[PDB]
Design a protein around this ligand. Structure first.
Ligand SMILES: CN(C)C[C@@H]1CCn2cc(c3ccccc32)C2=C(C(=O)NC2=O)c2cn(c3ccccc23)CCO1
Length: 277
């Protein structure tokens, strides 16, 4: 394999963002001029907060993925103090940014991006991997405005509860995650694209969780009817009754939903995304 890379091989630039246990920094490789998003973690901190399993899982899961709709892990290295993961730089940033900018997506854009997310989940679930924290913050956009899903340290390969707005009722009642937990999140995301806001909203996490377990949400007027029907088939309390799950016979029936009638599923990454407003 190519020589193990080192910090001195790069010109580090701006911080892209900061998390509780990592910082992602844009960096240009001197030998190639390539730009990578480098995620940097301090070994001592990860060890003190008992996060070794999550960092290990992040590397291991991303190393297994080989599909256009995921961020790529190109390389890893470490110095005495830090771990460095070299990732795709998804130049257009978070899907959440576009939701906030545009407001609500039109039906064409909703369909196209939902289709890419579904296709990505089909790939992931096919590998027996559950994301467990699917949300617009973690669905990035490349330079060509195709999706690139990230954030795999908290994945489950067939304890953790993800972002409250997207939490499935089973994680609150049974303390257990399955592939269908990601399908509930998909439902929330479709709703969010169409309505501009996610379906379960309240002033704190407790109040959100109470809404989720009671299925307490409503659709806005003019919500595209076939998208409403799809969301109703994903936001189902019983995880074995969600469209897409193995007990509902998998991704075929989901991709066959009438909302997706005009979608060509075989080659979405080669299609030109519709312009967002
Ligand atoms: C915790 N926080 C850092 C996660 C949050 C949004 C989530 N996030 C983006 C992110 C990662 C990597 C590992 C976990 C979570 C990530 C990535 C990138 C990137 O280019 N490739 C990535 O995989 C970016 C991170 N950021 C970007 C801003 C604008 C463009 C691209 C960004 C900062 C926002 O990151």
């Amino acid at each position: 394999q190519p020589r193990k890379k080192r910090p001195e091989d790069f010109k580090f630039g701006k911080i892209l963002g900061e998390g509780s246990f990592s910082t992602v920094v844009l960096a240009r490789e001197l030998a190639t001029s390539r730009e990578y998003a480098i995620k940097i973690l301090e070994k001592r901190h990860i060890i003190k907060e008992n996060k070794v399993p999550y960092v290990t899982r992040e590397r291991d899961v991303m190393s297994r993925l080989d599909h256009p709709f995921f961020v790529k892990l190109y390389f890893t290295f470490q110095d005495d103090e830090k771990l460095y993961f070299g990732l795709s730089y998804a130049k257009n940033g978070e899907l959440l940014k576009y939701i906030r900018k545009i407001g609500s997506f039109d039906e064409t854009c909703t369909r196209f991006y939902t289709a890419e997310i579904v296709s990505a989940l089909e790939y992931l679930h096919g590998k027996g991997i559950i994301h467990r924290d699917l949300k617009p913050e973690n669905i990035l956009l490349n330079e060509d405005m195709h999706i690139q899903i990230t954030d795999f340290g908290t994945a489950k390969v067939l304890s953790f509860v993800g972002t409250a707005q997207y939490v499935s009722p089973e994680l609150l009642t049974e303390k257990s995650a399955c592939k269908s937990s990601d399908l509930w999140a998909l439902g929330c995301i479709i709703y969010q694209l169409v309505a501009g806001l996610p379906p379960f909203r309240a002033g704190n996490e407790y109040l959100i969780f109470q809404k989720i377990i009671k299925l307490e949400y409503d659709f806005p007027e003019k919500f595209f009817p076939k998208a409403r029907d799809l969301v109703e088939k994903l936001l189902v309390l019983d995880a074995t009754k969600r469209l897409g799950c193995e007990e509902m016979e998998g991704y075929g029936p989901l991709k066959a939903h009438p909302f997706f009638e005009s979608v060509t599923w075989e080659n979405l990454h080669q299609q030109t995304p519709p312009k967002l407003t």
